[PDB]
Design a protein around this ligand. Structure first.
Ligand code: HEC
Ligand code: HEC
Ligand code: HEC
Ligand code: HEC
Ligand code: HEC
Ligand code: HEC
Ligand code: HEC
Ligand code: HEC
Ligand code: HEC
Ligand code: HEC
Ligand code: HEC
Ligand code: HEC
Ligand code: HEC
Ligand code: HEC
Ligand SMILES: [C-]#N
Ligand SMILES: [C-]#N
Ligand SMILES: [Ca+2]
Ligand SMILES: [Ca+2]
Ligand SMILES: [Ca+2]
Ligand SMILES: [Ca+2]
Ligand code: NA
Ligand code: NA
Ligand code: NA
Ligand code: NA
Ligand code: NA
Lengths: 518, 518
């Protein structure tokens, strides 16, 4: 059985913790629930850690007092199809292989599934670790609670004796790097300096051997990513988000300075040896838009190249961990701002961006966002009980499973079927424009080999490559973004029509140039 | 195909109809929809009918232009169990045979079923016509549309060559009389003088041979019972109701003079020659409480006896067609006012009232009635359509079949299961008190033979008989009333506790008197 410790003894040194813990709703929660610090207390000084205390990062540390929220979080949505490749005719991007050629996502890019699986899915996807990590067997794919208990309870490593990234299976890639893990787990929260910069107190950084880092990590989406364990108050912990909002002064709502002030973020820094080490962002309100934006954003978490001279930008560079914090129509400028692109297209040679799941930046300026609606209202609503204590559902999933709470309490004029119909109108329309955008991208791409072999000039090919950047950006935003336009239907429409326009321009350019060589 | 007539010519002699028809929502509906007056127009003067025009009473006269209301009305609710005798342990009155002994309802008293069957059910019930009328075969009991097309399309008469009331089956009664038919049909609306008084212009009256009258009647619950066919406005046609509300000055809401004035009734009389003949009551508002009270009331529609001297009150007497228009606690006074009782109990010899379905008089003063709710809100609600023209459902049935529209639009705090649970709490409690009331009534009744045979005095027996009147009234109101307390739970509770108190007093009186003789 747990035996409480004297928190006043800790507070003698830990004044920041005192200030947070004594005031919030965890003022009665003893440190022993999450820390084993006996040897630490025997050896520490006011400025030197001494023996390092044990800190629990497992989600079951919160589940004995918050079982309802834990059990809701760990539920597996079986209707969220697992390991479903997006580059197929029945998924999100039928022509993805042709369009993404040259990028690691060509090796595998599946649709997302329930949050319990995020860390194991990261470890086992074919693009990440060369096939090094696999489920122990094909039964384990069902085991959401097991994944939550720990990744290494359900996975194997093909070679525990080596730590290099290499291919164990032929059609895999080794794109994983330490930055990725920040959106899968925060088990490393005490072992990683802010931004992954080199730091004498950090075991891990942007330049670490990612296979070694992986082996030290266990739990997905820790409860403390959104809730400070000491104050119980709302927060974020993701460095790239704090960097955008606070360090670069862009605010929580870059398009709305008033909402940014009302729903702001305060950066709190913790030190090692009286040097800044790590940071958190305390929120003014329990604002899920910003909580979810720790991960559901467009980012850099990877090496790339400079737009200016084509030189390599490695993991050592700050730009390898970057939140652009820009909507689709501001993105090209944001990428120019840091002089960065992701890959050269394998067929066209164009410098291209790689977009990823920009839900937060897409939601900005939408009708729902402008009306004060937030991610949680549609994706983790309050539970409705005939008789009971209300709590917030932590099963983050499509509103289709809980339409009464997610939509119909606000939209009293609609039945469930009417609300579903409105979602599908947008998704069907948007998907049609995604498909047409891909058709035109593909038509352009297929002209590049013909143009090159016919002797079309480098100047014309470069003009077409410049068009390819924009045609790509204004399409791929929407295959990356998970709502198929629902989050901002007018923006999707405008973007996708722009993509098509750019590809059509490039097709005309290249056809005319080819025809002139004949 | 129908050919329109020149209505202006009719109006030269029918100013009363002109003033209604030209102003209301049937101003464009030609008379040929409901009248065949060709030979009438050829032979009439303004002071001489000439040949009698034909008037359609069938509901299909309205269904041509109002199919949705007609089809909703004629629907059969199969879940409303048919021919289900109330004097059984699993229905409303487990001890009914003992308690009602001496009255015709002992022969058969079934629960109500859908409105389509009202006229056929009246004709075929074992207590009504000595078993003379039967369904043609046992298949016809399902045929609601056929019954509406006409009773004699689905029934047979055991002896078309005779018109006397007599028993054709051994355990039947011949309680039917012409007053009954006024709550089953209004096919006779032009052939029956106000109250069924004798009149030169009336084919039928209170004193008619009911078997002959029955053969002239076809359709249940005519659409024009609630809607004037000329103005389309709200009305009642039932003489007994107009007599209580208007002639006797009691008002539409006897307990609320303000509501009576706002939601009142105007008596309109129609003449034959110089003499008043029939009447209707035009309503100030479309008030279902008053529409439904044409039938869902306690009434006399039968011969009886005088409380003063025990003499017979026959069908010729106006008291044989009477709406008491009194709540349960005013009823005994109302029956004393007309010096009337129904039957002498077969075992106790007590003069007793017979109560029938007093829904209107029970609903008065209830929380719902005081809040301006009316029968239609729970039993005939507006249809809710995702896309469509709203109409009023005419399928008058339990709210359990349409809880969203009947209850939950007002009670937003409840789920369907919660609302059902609240109904059942009241019905379960009320039924327990009905059962306990019957237990005590039965205990008293069973002491009468013992007391009589022991030589208990007539004075003591008469004391106990006076107690029996009250014990009976305060019980039977609630087996008669169809809501099992829901329409007025506090009144049911007070009444049933009074019944039990009266029976207990009588049991003590009789036991002590028997014990004293021994
Ligand atoms: C003064 C002698 C201390 C006492 C008493 C306690 N702690 Fe401590 N702790 C101390 C230092 C100098 C540091 C390094 C950071 C700093 O503020 O300079 C720490 C660090 C921790 C940590 C972080 C460990 C990690 O892995 O990074 C934890 C979780 C921690 N301390 C907890 C803790 C508890 C629960 C105490 C009461 C039992 C406690 N500390 C006392 C110095 C001192
Ligand atoms: C779980 C419900 C916790 C309770 C109770 C306490 N702490 Fe904690 N602590 C917890 C976690 C998950 C972490 C990791 C960092 C984060 O922000 O989530 C920590 C960290 C600390 C630290 C380190 C701060 C730093 O310099 O980086 C300290 C010094 C610390 N915790 C102290 C501490 C004290 C004294 C507590 C009892 C009053 C206490 N914690 C409770 C989780 C939980
Ligand atoms: C029991 C010993 C607890 C442990 C372990 C954890 N929490 Fe807790 N929490 C506890 C209490 C008694 C309360 C207050 C309840 C109330 O409403 O009065 C809380 C509250 C929270 C909250 C709400 C905070 C707020 O609204 O300001 C959150 C978000 C919360 N707790 C989160 C949480 C986390 C993430 C935990 C594991 C790190 C955790 N709690 C552990 C009791 C206990
Ligand atoms: C936060 C800014 C992220 C970083 C850094 C990385 N990932 Fe991610 N990933 C993130 C989200 C919000 C989602 C769900 C939404 C979606 O569009 O899928 C994902 C999903 C994955 C998946 C599952 C789906 C799939 O593509 O097969 C995997 C396998 C995955 N992520 C791997 C991964 C790798 C290898 C990363 C570094 C190169 C990486 N992620 C970083 C958020 C974030
Ligand atoms: C008993 C007669 C079985 C039947 C019927 C089914 N399965 Fe099975 N399965 C069985 C065993 C003994 C094992 C191996 C257990 C171990 O851990 O050693 C399995 C394995 C699987 C797996 C994993 C396959 C892999 O290559 O790792 C899966 C996905 C699986 N079983 C699914 C499954 C399905 C869906 C079944 C019905 C169609 C089915 N099994 C039947 C034993 C038996
Ligand atoms: C960010 C993605 C979250 C993660 C990770 C966890 N929770 Fe959470 N929690 C989140 C939100 C948006 C809210 C609602 C805030 C609001 O006021 O609208 C909550 C709330 C809680 C609470 C408070 C009580 C309640 O409303 O249910 C508790 C106790 C809580 N959360 C606990 C908790 C646990 C145990 C988690 C890991 C299993 C967890 N939260 C993760 C957002 C996020
Ligand atoms: C209601 C007004 C919403 C708000 C606020 C947010 N989202 Fe949403 N999201 C919504 C719908 C109707 C859909 C389509 C769901 C469907 O089943 O068709 C989505 C989709 C997503 C997804 C993908 C879900 C899945 O396909 O399984 C994700 C990952 C998602 N949304 C994330 C998300 C974020 C992070 C939000 C705040 C920035 C956000 N959503 C808000 C409706 C609504
Ligand atoms: C004057 C020359 C008349 C004309 C033109 C029409 N009607 Fe008539 N109608 C007239 C009289 C004198 C009476 C009898 C009044 C009385 O004292 O009893 C009637 C009666 C009717 C009736 C009721 C018949 C019944 O069953 O009692 C109806 C339905 C009726 N009349 C209809 C009607 C129509 C539709 C006419 C135009 C086609 C019409 N009448 C003309 C005198 C006259
Ligand atoms: C059906 C939609 C009708 C239309 C159109 C007209 N009439 Fe009618 N009328 C109808 C009914 C069912 C009855 C029976 C009585 C009742 O109140 O329901 C009548 C009655 C008459 C009478 C008799 C009035 C009386 O003195 O008792 C008359 C004189 C009469 N109707 C005339 C009449 C005229 C002239 C019409 C065309 C303008 C007309 N009716 C239309 C049903 C319907
Ligand atoms: C078509 C030739 C009709 C026949 C036959 C009947 N009705 Fe009618 N009715 C008709 C019309 C064009 C309207 C007006 C529609 C509108 O809203 O503009 C009506 C109206 C009614 C009403 C509503 C009256 C009101 O709200 O004031 C009722 C209650 C009604 N009609 C009843 C009714 C009856 C009982 C009929 C048979 C005797 C009947 N109608 C026939 C058209 C036609
Ligand atoms: C209006 C004041 C009525 C009079 C006059 C008569 N009845 Fe009736 N009856 C009426 C209603 C509102 C109901 C339904 C509610 C209920 O408690 O049943 C009924 C029902 C019947 C039934 C069906 C149920 C049954 O008792 O088996 C029959 C067979 C019946 N009524 C016959 C009947 C007789 C023979 C009447 C004259 C002696 C008579 N009714 C008059 C309303 C009215
Ligand atoms: C064909 C092999 C039949 C089977 C199977 C069922 N029924 Fe029948 N039924 C059948 C006939 C030829 C008749 C007589 C038709 C006529 O009008 O002459 C009937 C009659 C009935 C009746 C009426 C009985 C009466 O005495 O009037 C009923 C209520 C009835 N049938 C119901 C019924 C049920 C519910 C059946 C399944 C259990 C059933 N029948 C089967 C022919 C056949
Ligand atoms: C009294 C017991 C009624 C009988 C008999 C018929 N109807 Fe009716 N009707 C009734 C009510 C209480 C209402 C609603 C009044 C309100 O405003 O709340 C209606 C309404 C109509 C209407 C108007 C349009 C609508 O609201 O649907 C029509 C056209 C109508 N009723 C037609 C109609 C028919 C054709 C009938 C015989 C099948 C019939 N009504 C009988 C009450 C009563
Ligand atoms: C809602 C507040 C109601 C009002 C207004 C009226 N009634 Fe009602 N009634 C109501 C309930 C909940 C019930 C019980 C139904 C059940 O399924 O348990 C009833 C019952 C009846 C019945 C019997 C129905 C059946 O058992 O099939 C009748 C004949 C009835 N009610 C008639 C009626 C009258 C005429 C009303 C106006 C005076 C009236 N009800 C109003 C709910 C409500
Ligand atoms: C992940 N991207
Ligand atoms: C009928 N009573
Ligand atoms: Ca999914
Ligand atoms: Ca990117
Ligand atoms: Ca019934
Ligand atoms: Ca009576
Ligand atoms: Na899905
Ligand atoms: Na392996
Ligand atoms: Na091709
Ligand atoms: Na029933
Ligand atoms: Na209905």
């Amino acid at each position: 059985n747990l035996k409480p410790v004297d928190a006043m003894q800790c507070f003698d040194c830990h004044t920041q913790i005192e200030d947070m813990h004594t005031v919030g709703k965890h003022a009665t929660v003893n440190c022993v629930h999450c820390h084993d610090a006996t040897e630490h207390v025997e050896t520490a000084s006011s400025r030197r850690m001494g023996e390092r205390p044990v800190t629990r990062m497992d989600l079951e540390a919160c589940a004995t007092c918050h079982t309802a929220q834990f059990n809701s979080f760990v539920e597996v949505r079986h209707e969220s199809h697992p390991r479903l490749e997006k580059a197929t005719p029945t998924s999100r991007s039928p022509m993805f292989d042709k369009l993404i050629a040259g990028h690691g996502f060509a090796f595998e890019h599946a649709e997302p599934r329930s949050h319990a699986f995020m860390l194991v899915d990261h470890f086992v996807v074919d693009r990440a670790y060369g096939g090094r990590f696999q489920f122990k067997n094909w039964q384990k794919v069902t085991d959401g609670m097991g994944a939550v208990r720990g990744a290494w309870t359900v996975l194997t490593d093909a070679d525990p004796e080596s730590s290099d990234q290499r291919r164990f299976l032929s059609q895999t890639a080794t794109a994983a790097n330490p930055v990725c893990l920040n959106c899968k787990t925060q088990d490393h929260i005490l072992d990683w300096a802010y931004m992954g910069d080199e730091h004498e107190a950090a075991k891990w950084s942007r330049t670490s051997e990612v296979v070694e880092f992986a082996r030290d990590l266990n739990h997905p989406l820790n409860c403390f990513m959104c809730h400070d364990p000491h104050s119980a108050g709302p927060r974020v912990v993701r460095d790239g988000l704090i960097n955008a909002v606070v360090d670069r002064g862009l605010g929580t709502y870059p398009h709305d300075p008033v909402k940014s002030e009302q729903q702001g973020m305060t950066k709190v820094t913790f030190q090692r040896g009286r040097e800044d080490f790590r940071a958190i962002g305390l929120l003014d309100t329990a604002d899920s838009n910003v909580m979810c934006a720790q991960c559901h954003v467009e980012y850099n978490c990877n090496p790339g190249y400079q737009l200016s001279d084509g030189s390599r930008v490695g993991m050592d560079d700050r730009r390898a961990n970057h939140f652009f914090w820009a909507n689709v129509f501001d993105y090209k400028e944001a990428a120019q701002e840091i002089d960065f692109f992701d890959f050269r297209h394998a067929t066209t040679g164009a410098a291209l961006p790689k977009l990823q799941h920009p839900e937060a930046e897409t939601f900005w300026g939408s009708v729902h966002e402008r009306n004060g609606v937030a991610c949680a209202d549609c994706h983790m609503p309050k539970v409705q009980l005939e008789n009971g204590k209300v709590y917030t559902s932590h099963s983050q999933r499509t509103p289709r499973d809980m339409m009464g709470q997610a939509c119909l309490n606000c939209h009293a004029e609609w039945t469930e079927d009417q609300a579903l119909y409105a979602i599908d109108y947008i998704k069907n329309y948007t998907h049609g424009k995604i498909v047409k955008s891909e058709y035109w991208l593909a038509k352009m791409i297929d002209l590049f080999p013909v143009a090159k072999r016919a002797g079309v000039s480098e100047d014309v090919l470069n003009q077409a490559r410049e068009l390819h950047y924009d045609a790509h950006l204004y399409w791929e935003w929407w295959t990356a973004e998970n709502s198929v336009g629902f989050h901002n239907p007018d923006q999707a429409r405008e973007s996708l029509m722009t993509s098509i326009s750019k590809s059509k321009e490039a097709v005309s350019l290249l056809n005319d140039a080819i025809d002139a060589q004949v």
